[PDB]
Amino acid sequence: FSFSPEPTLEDIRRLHAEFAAERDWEQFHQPRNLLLALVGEVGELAELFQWKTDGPQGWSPRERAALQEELSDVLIYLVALAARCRVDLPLAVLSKMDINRRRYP
Amino acid sequence: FSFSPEPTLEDIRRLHAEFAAERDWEQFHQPRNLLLALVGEVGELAELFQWKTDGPQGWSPRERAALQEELSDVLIYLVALAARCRVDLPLAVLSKMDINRRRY
Amino acid sequence: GRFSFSPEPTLEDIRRLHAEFAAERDWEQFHQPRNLLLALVGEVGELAELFQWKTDGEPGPQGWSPRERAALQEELSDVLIYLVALAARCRVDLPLAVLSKMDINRRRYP
Amino acid sequence: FSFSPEPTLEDIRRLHAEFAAERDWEQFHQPRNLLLALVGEVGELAELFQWKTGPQGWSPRERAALQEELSDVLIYLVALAARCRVDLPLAVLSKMDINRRRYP
Ligand SMILES: CC(C)[C@]12O[C@H]1[C@@H]1O[C@]13[C@]1(O[C@H]1C[C@H]1C4=C(CC[C@@]13C)C(=O)OC4)[C@@H]2O
Ligand SMILES: CC(C)[C@]12O[C@H]1[C@@H]1O[C@]13[C@]1(O[C@H]1C[C@H]1C4=C(CC[C@@]13C)C(=O)OC4)[C@@H]2O
Ligand SMILES: CC(C)[C@]12O[C@H]1[C@@H]1O[C@]13[C@]1(O[C@H]1C[C@H]1C4=C(CC[C@@]13C)C(=O)OC4)[C@@H]2O
Ligand SMILES: CC(C)[C@]12O[C@H]1[C@@H]1O[C@]13[C@]1(O[C@H]1C[C@H]1C4=C(CC[C@@]13C)C(=O)OC4)[C@@H]2O
Ligand SMILES: [Mg+2]
Ligand SMILES: [Mg+2]
Ligand SMILES: [Mg+2]
Ligand SMILES: [Mg+2]
């Protein structure tokens, strides 16, 4: 299994910044607003799993549709938040992976 | 302001699965474990912000170090979760954005 | 006078009420700890959705719209119900655990 | 299994309000501050469970952590309800009525 090669994280940051700036929403995207929107989307992701004990690759296409959306909503707000904080998220993830290799040899 | 072009979401998925297999951690990466690890990291992000009543850009280097690392972990667990579910996260994001444009 | 909670239901009352609600529907079989935990997370997220675009500033939640206030009451209530259920399902005596946490907090912040 | 009869929710609110007043902390207890701190405590609870594909069979130290994090979540939920002037025990009764109509 693997992801498609695109959109990348930068693609996602650009599409969302453009989406938001065309609608004059950037004035609502203070960090703590985006962090709570993230929390709320993580909450909608959790509602999909809450009555489903470990035993999603076998869910129906329809309930995998709801899962794709909620995973996407989390990612979009996470990218918005990181960008609002001037954090280069793909490089931060390489720095974190490097730390993890050294901590767990 | 922008992000660097690499690693990609698929880059991240790969690095972390190899990292996890090499340590026989796959066995702990059932969907709901990864969902709850994601929740734990979002909480660590909230603890950074909880008493910042009403600017990350001009935060101290230690706080910016904490922010970068927690945002990274959220993204890693999110990618790993989506892979464990066999969801193509980049295309799903693109579908969602269309939904978002149709809704607004 | 100054603001107060009502005296009932207590935490034990809520545990009983919720257990009866589940028993009436045959739902206890779905109330494994990790199920209730993720249910709590979903409700915490619905609470966050009420506040996400609302910057802090008096008057605050007390000056919200009637339906916004109703949604706040229902969301705070939902978090509490699943917390009680989770604690009960883990065999945690929540009222006494609170007393014990308040002593921990007094030592940490003398 | 049952809960002890005390402290009630009103007891918890008073104890925490006096604890906060004594330390001059009520100035930091804006609603979104308390909400984010609640989110943080929920994350710590998530962490006790994340790698656990039963709580009663957990070690005494893990059960101690579980008691403490459940209690933290409850104190911040209480603090937030009060800061919002929500009579939390009565709201619960209304909520149970709502649930009975949603699920006849
Ligand atoms: C005032 C109230 C009726 C209100 O809820 C708020 C917010 O102002 C928004 C809202 O319109 C909705 C759509 C929101 C949206 C944002 C940014 C902010 C929102 C614009 C985002 O990130 O995605 C969705 C509505 O007017
Ligand atoms: C199968 C799927 C569409 C499903 O979602 C699940 C769960 O099985 C439930 C569900 O009916 C809904 C409502 C749920 C409910 C419970 C416990 C379990 C639920 C019964 C609870 O705690 O409050 C609400 C539906 O069948
Ligand atoms: C058994 C207990 C002491 C235990 O907590 C568990 C889990 O087994 C882990 C743990 O070792 C820690 C590190 C964990 C790690 C994971 C995946 C699973 C963990 C391996 C991950 O992706 O992030 C880091 C520890 O032994
Ligand atoms: C400035 C920073 C290092 C700072 O973190 C903030 C907050 O001001 C607090 C803090 O001191 C810690 C303890 C905090 C506390 C509160 C209320 C607010 C806190 C007082 C609460 O509810 O429980 C714990 C520190 O100065
Ligand atoms: Mg959503
Ligand atoms: Mg972390
Ligand atoms: Mg609800
Ligand atoms: Mg804690």
XYZ file of C-alpha atoms and ligand atoms in Angstrom:
531
model
C 0.000 0.000 0.000
C 0.969 3.623 -0.612
C -0.372 7.173 -1.053
C -0.678 9.052 -4.335
C 2.354 11.299 -5.040
C 0.338 14.536 -5.026
C -0.915 16.847 -3.492
C 2.079 17.386 -1.280
C 1.966 19.286 1.989
C 2.980 22.491 0.225
C 0.204 21.937 -2.337
C -2.226 21.530 0.567
C -0.979 24.680 2.308
C -1.343 26.707 -0.926
C -4.810 25.434 -1.857
C -6.037 26.124 1.636
C -4.458 29.566 1.990
C -5.987 30.541 -1.368
C -9.381 29.067 -0.437
C -9.273 31.015 2.834
C -8.002 34.297 1.408
C -10.608 34.349 -1.357
C -13.336 34.203 1.331
C -11.717 36.690 3.815
C -11.392 33.961 6.459
C -7.737 34.566 7.348
C -8.839 37.070 9.991
C -10.410 34.112 11.890
C -7.317 31.884 11.676
C -5.514 32.934 14.822
C -3.551 29.937 16.122
C -5.844 29.072 19.040
C -8.857 29.179 16.708
C -7.232 26.696 14.335
C -6.122 24.506 17.233
C -9.699 24.242 18.511
C -10.973 23.581 14.967
C -8.422 20.811 14.812
C -9.668 19.440 18.143
C -13.192 19.489 16.757
C -12.230 17.582 13.620
C -10.261 15.069 15.673
C -13.520 14.656 17.576
C -15.475 13.849 14.382
C -12.771 11.326 13.443
C -13.125 9.687 16.863
C -16.917 9.347 16.534
C -16.349 7.079 13.531
C -14.308 4.625 15.632
C -16.016 4.932 19.004
C -18.325 1.897 18.777
C -15.879 -0.082 16.547
C -13.485 -2.298 18.532
C -10.151 -3.269 16.801
C -10.675 -6.506 14.800
C -11.283 0.057 8.488
C -9.597 -1.657 5.469
C -12.792 -3.814 5.566
C -15.424 -1.097 6.100
C -17.962 -0.339 3.383
C -16.997 2.172 0.672
C -19.617 4.517 2.182
C -18.251 4.512 5.714
C -14.733 4.673 4.294
C -15.989 7.838 2.569
C -16.813 9.461 5.918
C -13.381 8.330 7.165
C -11.560 9.919 4.208
C -13.272 13.259 4.842
C -12.546 13.338 8.584
C -8.887 12.369 8.081
C -8.687 15.115 5.464
C -10.289 17.724 7.781
C -7.746 16.986 10.479
C -4.877 17.284 7.985
C -6.138 20.567 6.512
C -6.435 22.304 9.905
C -3.097 20.875 11.026
C -1.469 22.382 7.889
C -3.287 25.691 8.443
C -2.137 25.832 12.057
C 1.491 25.000 11.243
C 1.608 27.619 8.477
C -0.021 30.228 10.721
C 2.764 29.501 13.233
C 5.457 29.821 10.494
C 6.512 26.183 10.963
C 7.988 24.373 7.948
C 6.055 21.176 8.650
C 7.741 18.694 6.244
C 11.204 19.645 7.569
C 9.974 19.508 11.180
C 8.821 15.924 10.455
C 12.354 15.040 9.107
C 13.920 16.523 12.284
C 11.450 14.459 14.404
C 12.175 11.225 12.492
C 15.944 11.800 12.942
C 15.399 12.225 16.734
C 13.270 9.001 16.823
C 16.025 6.928 15.090
C 18.620 8.092 17.699
C 16.276 7.667 20.745
C 15.120 4.170 19.672
C 18.317 2.595 18.207
C 5.754 32.032 3.621
C 5.583 28.407 2.391
C 6.551 24.808 3.177
C 9.513 22.922 1.728
C 8.654 20.507 -1.122
C 9.935 17.326 0.586
C 9.190 14.989 2.344
C 5.798 14.302 0.791
C 2.912 12.566 2.515
C 4.002 9.309 0.822
C 7.600 9.955 1.876
C 6.367 10.296 5.453
C 4.215 7.162 5.306
C 7.235 5.159 4.052
C 9.830 6.485 6.514
C 7.583 5.721 9.450
C 6.445 2.244 8.369
C 10.077 1.216 7.812
C 10.968 2.777 11.156
C 8.096 0.853 12.766
C 8.752 -2.507 11.079
C 12.474 -2.389 11.955
C 11.430 -2.149 15.596
C 8.499 -4.602 15.430
C 6.125 -1.831 16.484
C 3.566 -2.605 13.752
C 1.863 -4.877 16.273
C 0.937 -1.806 18.373
C -0.368 0.211 15.396
C -3.957 -0.980 15.207
C -6.269 1.796 13.954
C -7.632 2.848 17.360
C -4.219 2.849 19.063
C -2.992 5.287 16.409
C -6.194 7.322 16.788
C -5.618 7.612 20.534
C -1.915 8.431 20.084
C -3.068 11.183 17.750
C -5.396 12.439 20.483
C -2.556 12.447 23.029
C -0.399 14.612 20.771
C -3.252 17.124 20.021
C -3.528 17.442 23.858
C 0.211 18.253 24.169
C -0.423 20.979 21.537
C -3.331 22.309 23.709
C -1.064 22.343 26.811
C 1.317 24.598 24.901
C -1.526 27.040 24.228
C -3.806 26.702 27.214
C -2.697 29.807 29.194
C -1.766 31.949 26.107
C -4.822 34.169 26.599
C -5.953 35.966 23.423
C 1.967 35.057 18.934
C 3.715 31.732 18.077
C 5.930 33.549 15.443
C 7.752 35.450 18.262
C 7.711 32.629 20.892
C 10.894 31.644 22.788
C 13.188 29.014 21.036
C 12.223 26.350 23.605
C 8.449 26.868 22.995
C 8.965 26.914 19.195
C 10.977 23.714 19.595
C 8.021 22.158 21.455
C 5.536 23.399 18.848
C 7.467 22.023 15.879
C 7.852 18.609 17.479
C 4.208 18.244 18.548
C 2.807 19.349 15.194
C 5.166 16.826 13.593
C 3.956 13.982 15.801
C 0.340 14.842 15.073
C 1.110 14.561 11.348
C 3.037 11.302 11.715
C 0.276 9.590 13.677
C -2.315 10.968 11.252
C -0.423 9.588 8.239
C 0.173 6.253 9.940
C -3.482 6.023 10.901
C -4.615 6.729 7.366
C -2.149 4.148 5.943
C -3.302 1.521 8.458
C -6.842 2.227 7.201
C -5.671 1.978 3.598
C -6.806 5.521 2.793
C -5.031 7.516 0.093
C -4.719 10.647 2.189
C -3.527 13.103 -0.521
C -6.406 12.339 -2.896
C -8.915 12.398 -0.033
C -7.728 15.903 0.840
C -8.399 16.934 -2.759
C -11.887 15.471 -2.768
C -12.552 17.301 0.526
C -11.399 20.649 -0.834
C -13.904 20.269 -3.701
C -16.588 19.560 -1.121
C -15.378 22.702 0.672
C -15.682 24.794 -2.493
C -19.157 23.436 -3.215
C -20.222 24.222 0.348
C -18.888 27.802 0.036
C -26.206 35.914 45.714
C -23.299 34.420 43.760
C -23.409 31.602 41.211
C -23.906 27.997 42.381
C -24.601 24.520 41.019
C -27.746 22.640 41.998
C -27.258 19.924 44.660
C -28.482 16.990 42.525
C -27.786 14.966 40.524
C -24.543 14.014 42.245
C -21.914 11.977 40.386
C -23.389 8.728 41.768
C -26.861 9.804 40.583
C -25.464 10.388 37.106
C -23.776 6.979 37.044
C -27.101 5.321 38.017
C -29.132 7.396 35.546
C -26.759 6.549 32.737
C -26.603 2.833 33.640
C -30.419 2.699 33.674
C -30.506 4.458 30.280
C -28.102 1.866 28.900
C -29.969 -1.048 30.571
C -33.272 0.010 29.034
C -31.687 -0.283 25.608
C -29.369 -3.255 26.115
C -26.353 -1.047 25.377
C -23.894 -1.995 28.162
C -22.370 -4.492 25.736
C -20.961 -1.555 23.711
C -19.506 0.333 26.739
C -15.985 -1.066 26.825
C -13.583 1.492 28.392
C -11.875 2.492 25.063
C -15.341 2.921 23.455
C -16.415 5.323 26.221
C -13.030 7.089 26.016
C -13.387 7.777 22.295
C -17.010 8.816 22.898
C -15.704 11.340 25.393
C -13.204 12.579 22.770
C -15.994 13.143 20.211
C -17.971 15.176 22.746
C -14.916 17.179 23.783
C -14.578 17.983 20.079
C -18.210 19.075 19.782
C -17.568 21.404 22.814
C -14.440 22.847 21.025
C -16.503 23.480 17.847
C -18.736 25.890 19.868
C -15.662 27.975 20.917
C -13.310 27.667 17.809
C -14.220 31.050 16.060
C -15.186 32.798 19.371
C -12.156 34.740 20.727
C -12.233 35.333 24.500
C -13.781 38.652 25.503
C -16.491 39.698 27.961
C -19.333 39.187 28.167
C -18.236 35.675 26.960
C -20.349 32.464 26.936
C -22.933 34.098 29.308
C -23.784 36.601 26.452
C -24.136 33.863 23.749
C -27.313 33.306 21.699
C -30.070 31.136 23.291
C -29.330 28.123 20.965
C -25.533 28.627 21.472
C -26.117 28.486 25.281
C -28.376 25.418 24.847
C -25.602 23.738 22.763
C -22.997 24.588 25.487
C -25.241 23.046 28.206
C -25.825 19.900 26.105
C -22.062 19.551 25.216
C -20.769 20.094 28.803
C -23.448 17.591 29.932
C -22.342 15.025 27.287
C -18.684 15.236 28.337
C -19.657 14.686 31.960
C -21.914 11.727 31.224
C -19.257 9.843 29.298
C -16.610 10.752 31.912
C -18.816 9.239 34.628
C -19.495 6.188 32.499
C -15.779 5.780 31.730
C -14.832 6.123 35.368
C -17.518 3.661 36.476
C -16.493 1.171 33.801
C -12.842 1.378 35.029
C -13.925 0.914 38.697
C -12.745 4.384 39.654
C -14.577 6.043 42.559
C -14.610 9.424 40.878
C -15.699 11.578 43.903
C -12.863 10.256 46.055
C -10.365 10.391 43.192
C -11.191 14.116 43.034
C -10.498 14.586 46.727
C -7.187 12.801 46.231
C -6.305 14.970 43.223
C -7.042 18.151 45.184
C -4.503 17.075 47.862
C -1.944 16.368 45.136
C -2.656 19.825 43.764
C -2.201 21.469 47.185
C 1.233 19.882 47.576
C 2.293 20.848 44.071
C 1.059 24.439 44.467
C 1.353 25.043 48.219
C -19.718 -0.858 41.616
C -20.809 2.544 42.932
C -19.436 5.973 43.613
C -19.043 7.492 47.041
C -21.801 9.989 47.877
C -19.446 13.006 48.349
C -18.000 15.286 47.074
C -20.905 16.397 44.849
C -20.407 18.586 41.779
C -21.201 21.690 43.850
C -18.559 20.614 46.401
C -16.037 20.235 43.577
C -16.817 23.685 42.188
C -16.450 25.327 45.612
C -13.229 23.493 46.446
C -11.669 24.449 43.145
C -12.918 28.055 43.263
C -11.414 28.550 46.731
C -8.191 26.820 45.672
C -7.958 29.147 42.682
C -8.972 32.235 44.711
C -6.317 31.550 47.359
C -3.617 31.598 44.675
C -5.026 34.534 42.673
C -5.511 32.296 39.611
C -9.066 33.270 38.595
C -7.590 35.888 36.242
C -6.192 33.042 34.045
C -9.486 31.083 33.920
C -11.007 32.468 30.751
C -13.349 29.951 29.062
C -11.046 29.047 26.154
C -8.125 28.678 28.592
C -10.094 26.193 30.677
C -11.296 24.446 27.535
C -7.794 23.964 26.186
C -6.597 22.705 29.592
C -9.494 20.223 29.561
C -8.384 19.111 26.075
C -4.862 18.639 27.437
C -6.076 16.432 30.304
C -8.195 14.412 27.884
C -5.007 13.863 25.868
C -3.191 12.515 28.931
C -6.091 10.091 29.504
C -5.838 9.071 25.835
C -2.197 8.267 26.432
C -2.844 5.736 29.194
C -5.008 3.807 26.742
C -3.286 4.297 23.389
C -1.125 1.138 23.280
C -3.734 -0.981 25.117
C -5.462 -2.916 22.330
C -8.611 -4.209 30.960
C -8.154 -1.147 33.299
C -8.824 -3.321 36.434
C -5.828 -5.558 35.383
C -3.474 -2.528 35.107
C -0.584 -2.049 37.565
C -1.198 0.043 40.727
C 0.833 2.897 39.229
C -1.178 2.972 35.995
C -4.422 2.862 38.021
C -3.138 5.775 40.103
C -2.486 7.759 36.867
C -5.964 6.806 35.612
C -7.630 8.102 38.772
C -5.624 11.325 38.606
C -6.304 12.059 34.930
C -10.006 11.249 35.224
C -10.071 13.671 38.174
C -8.211 16.429 36.248
C -10.680 16.204 33.357
C -13.569 16.548 35.816
C -12.084 19.533 37.677
C -11.500 21.509 34.442
C -14.967 20.537 33.115
C -16.430 21.835 36.377
C -14.288 24.970 36.270
C -15.408 25.671 32.674
C -19.108 25.031 33.339
C -18.989 27.476 36.242
C -17.014 30.067 34.315
C -19.774 29.864 31.698
C -22.516 30.095 34.424
C -23.898 26.707 33.450
C -25.702 24.813 36.242
C -24.061 21.572 35.221
C -26.142 19.052 37.265
C -29.408 20.455 35.884
C -28.067 20.531 32.341
C -27.329 16.814 32.698
C -30.973 16.110 33.582
C -32.145 18.040 30.525
C -29.555 16.141 28.491
C -30.843 12.744 29.681
C -34.351 13.836 28.642
C -32.981 14.827 25.219
C -31.239 11.414 24.953
C -34.479 9.574 25.826
C -36.277 11.364 22.972
C -33.432 10.811 20.504
C -33.371 7.075 21.425
C -36.981 6.136 22.368
C -20.639 34.187 13.309
C -21.149 32.775 12.967
C -22.602 32.716 12.428
C -20.074 32.170 12.031
O -19.600 30.841 12.406
C -18.676 31.877 12.540
C -17.434 32.109 11.749
O -17.254 33.024 10.690
C -17.484 31.690 10.266
C -18.942 31.275 9.958
O -19.310 31.425 8.627
C -19.048 30.111 8.990
C -17.845 29.483 8.292
C -16.526 29.544 9.138
C -15.384 28.865 8.432
C -14.090 29.212 8.738
C -13.683 30.551 9.286
C -14.761 31.243 10.161
C -16.210 30.902 9.838
C -16.084 31.874 8.489
C -13.253 28.057 8.374
O -12.098 27.820 8.578
O -13.994 27.134 7.707
C -15.361 27.445 7.860
C -20.263 31.946 10.515
O -20.400 33.167 9.921
C -23.745 0.089 13.500
C -23.694 1.631 13.565
C -24.446 2.391 12.444
C -24.154 1.992 14.993
O -23.586 3.222 15.540
C -23.161 2.035 16.132
C -23.454 1.537 17.504
O -24.421 0.597 17.895
C -24.817 1.958 18.098
C -25.591 2.621 16.955
O -26.944 2.702 17.183
C -26.270 3.916 17.321
C -26.254 4.527 18.720
C -25.144 4.000 19.698
C -25.419 4.451 21.098
C -24.729 3.864 22.129
C -24.058 2.525 22.088
C -23.959 1.832 20.698
C -24.660 2.527 19.545
C -26.065 1.716 20.031
C -24.577 4.885 23.162
O -23.840 4.907 24.100
O -25.401 5.933 22.919
C -25.753 5.886 21.549
C -25.634 2.149 15.436
O -26.231 0.919 15.358
C 4.535 -2.054 27.371
C 4.779 -0.583 27.762
C 5.835 -0.365 28.881
C 5.072 0.139 26.426
O 4.397 1.422 26.222
C 3.970 0.369 25.405
C 4.159 0.198 23.933
O 5.100 -0.641 23.307
C 5.479 0.736 23.337
C 6.371 1.182 24.518
O 7.725 1.101 24.241
C 7.217 2.403 24.230
C 7.255 3.121 22.879
C 5.964 2.956 21.995
C 6.127 3.627 20.654
C 5.181 3.386 19.688
C 4.505 2.061 19.525
C 4.387 1.181 20.804
C 5.267 1.553 21.998
C 6.487 0.639 21.270
C 5.245 4.522 18.736
O 4.928 4.656 17.581
O 5.795 5.578 19.388
C 6.640 5.059 20.403
C 6.492 0.520 25.949
O 7.227 -0.627 25.829
C 3.669 32.056 32.137
C 3.758 30.528 32.262
C 5.170 29.964 32.548
C 2.669 30.125 33.286
O 1.980 28.887 32.951
C 1.210 30.041 32.884
C 0.054 30.389 33.765
O 0.028 31.224 34.899
C 0.146 29.838 35.204
C 1.581 29.289 35.403
O 2.013 29.320 36.717
C 1.643 28.054 36.280
C 0.418 27.445 36.968
C -0.919 27.666 36.177
C -2.098 26.979 36.827
C -3.379 27.437 36.631
C -3.694 28.857 36.264
C -2.600 29.538 35.392
C -1.165 29.093 35.621
C -1.173 29.932 37.060
C -4.282 26.282 36.875
O -5.458 26.106 36.717
O -3.564 25.238 37.363
C -2.196 25.497 37.186
C 2.919 29.877 34.793
O 3.170 31.081 35.382
Mg -15.443 17.091 9.489
Mg 5.186 14.857 21.297
Mg -23.015 15.985 21.962
Mg -2.928 15.528 34.445
